[PDB]
Amino acid sequence: SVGIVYGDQYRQLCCSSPKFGDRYALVMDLINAYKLIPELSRVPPLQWDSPSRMYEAVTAFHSTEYVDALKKLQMLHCEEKELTADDELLMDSFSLNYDCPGFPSVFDYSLAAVQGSLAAASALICRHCEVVINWGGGWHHAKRSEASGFCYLNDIVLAIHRLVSSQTRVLYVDLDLHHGDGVEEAFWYSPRVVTFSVHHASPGFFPGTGTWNFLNGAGRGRFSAFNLPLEEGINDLDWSNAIGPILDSLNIVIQPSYVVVQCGADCLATDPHRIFRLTNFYPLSGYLYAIKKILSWKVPTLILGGGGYNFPDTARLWTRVTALTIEEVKGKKMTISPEIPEHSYFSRYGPDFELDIDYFPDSIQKHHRRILEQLRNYADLNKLIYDYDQVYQLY
Numbered sequence: 001s002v003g004i005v006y007g008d009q010y011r012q013l014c015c016s017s018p019k020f021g022d023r024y025a026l027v028m029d030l031i032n033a034y035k036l037i038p039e040l041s042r043v044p045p046l047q048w049d050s051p052s053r054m055y056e057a058v059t060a061f062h063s064t065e066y067v068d069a070l071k072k073l074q075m076l077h078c079e080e081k082e083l084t085a086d087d088e089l090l091m092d093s094f095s096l097n098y099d100c101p102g103f104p105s106v107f108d109y110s111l112a113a114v115q116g117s118l119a120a121a122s123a124l125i126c127r128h129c130e131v132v133i134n135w136g137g138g139w140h141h142a143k144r145s146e147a148s149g150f151c152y153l154n155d156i157v158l159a160i161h162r163l164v165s166s167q168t169r170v171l172y173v174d175l176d177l178h179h180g181d182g183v184e185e186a187f188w189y190s191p192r193v194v195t196f197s198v199h200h201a202s203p204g205f206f207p208g209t210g211t212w213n214f215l216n217g218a219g220r221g222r223f224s225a226f227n228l229p230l231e232e233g234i235n236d237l238d239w240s241n242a243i244g245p246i247l248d249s250l251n252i253v254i255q256p257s258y259v260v261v262q263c264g265a266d267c268l269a270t271d272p273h274r275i276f277r278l279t280n281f282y283p284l285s286g287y288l289y290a291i292k293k294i295l296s297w298k299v300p301t302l303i304l305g306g307g308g309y310n311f312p313d314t315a316r317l318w319t320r321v322t323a324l325t326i327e328e329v330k331g332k333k334m335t336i337s338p339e340i341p342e343h344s345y346f347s348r349y350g351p352d353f354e355l356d357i358d359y360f361p362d363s364i365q366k367h368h369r370r371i372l373e374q375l376r377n378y379a380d381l382n383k384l385i386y387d388y389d390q391v392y393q394l395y
């Protein structure tokens with residue numbers, strides 16, 4: 001069973017932010033336009049018995065003072081009440097400013113992603129679903145006491161905490177254009193959550209981490225945080241060859257109980273960032289290559305969204321990821337028309353109204369040797385036994 005998180009209230013909240021507007025509606029409506037919803041099990045967002053239960057859940061990671069501030073920000077924006085100088089200073093102390101400003105539903109909006117991803121984790125734990133998709137989740141930058149990169153609450157960290165707290169190891173794979181710093185930091189000292197981010201890094205590029213400083217964890221979590229920074233311009237094939245052996249080696253050595261994949265769509269060639277040149281093509285899209293490989297491991301998996309600022313092309317990609325997941329999990333052939341079906345947001349898919357995006361297409365060897373060494377160090381530190389040459393052969 002492949003699950004997907006949605007709901008009427010969830011849709012309105014996921015569409016209430018100024019930065020991401022109606023992206024989630026385009027995504028879910030295109031999935032619906034392609035007749036995928038009857039193939040999927042709807043997973044409703046988690047709700048709580050009381051304010052105290054909600055607060056307990058969110059402060060499993062975030063600080064009480066930060067959650068207090070995020071609630072107050074919504075309350076202030078809920079009225080005409082412009083912030084006092086003291087309130088501005090309070091918000092600044094949590095980076096609830098500039099790129100992460102307040103809006104009338106900022107706490108409800110960020111809490112909704114947490115509700116969705118926690119529900120997804122529970123459905124995996126109870127084995128109701130083999131894979132769960134949450135295209136309203138994936139906010140990998142939020143820190144314990146700091147908003148960052150349009151992320152206010154870290155739904156990923158809270159979902160992973162629910163998985164490991166259910167011997168359990170989690171592999172987190174972050175495919176976003178940006179380094180998954182918030183998730184990496186949360187599990188820096190934890191050997192049982194191994195994090196792996198592939199991303200662009202360059203001077204002045206957000207958030208700045210995930211590159212040479214390589215730090216890789218600390219304490220009992222030493223060697224447990226993996227990173228592969230790539231230069232601008234990389235295409236589907238080169239990105240696939242860069243991460244492919246790393247993914248397979250992580251699965252062999254870690255033997256994870258769960259995999260959590262952040263599938264931010266800002267690596268697409270048509271994203272306004274214009275840094276990587278990945279596609280959604282399925283003849284092959286780097287995203288689909290990676291997701292297909294992860295799903296072949298037959299490990300219960302959470303697939304999350306993230307970045308993606310070209311909303312129709314994000315919808316194009318995530319619709320294909322959803323169909324691929326159905327096909328790989330259920331063994332059911334999926335046939336998506338190359339033409340965008342008529343539906344509410346059909347006019348947004350100009351100019352050609354095709355499902356393919358409108359695009360025409362040894363430093364990594366050193367990184368591979370470095371990561372192989374780090375994997376061996378992780379395995380030694382943690383008394384894990386693994387076929388050294390079967391893993392080296394992957395590269």
Ligand SMILES: CCCCCC(=O)N(O)[C@H]1CC(=O)N(c2ccc(Cl)cc2)C1=O
Pocket residue numbers: 099138139140141148149150151176178206264266305306307308
């Ligand atoms: C969780 C994924 C979506 C939101 C975060 C993310 O992964 N995004 O896609 C980037 C895009 C971008 O340009 N930023 C950014 C740049 C500079 C500054 Cl200062 C703050 C934010 C992000 O956070």
Ligand SMILES: [K+]
Pocket residue numbers: 174175176177178179180197198199
């Ligand atoms: K990433």
Ligand SMILES: [K+]
Pocket residue numbers: 187188189190191192193194195217221224225
């Ligand atoms: K870790």
Ligand SMILES: [Zn+2]
Pocket residue numbers: 176177178264266306307308
């Ligand atoms: Zn991003």
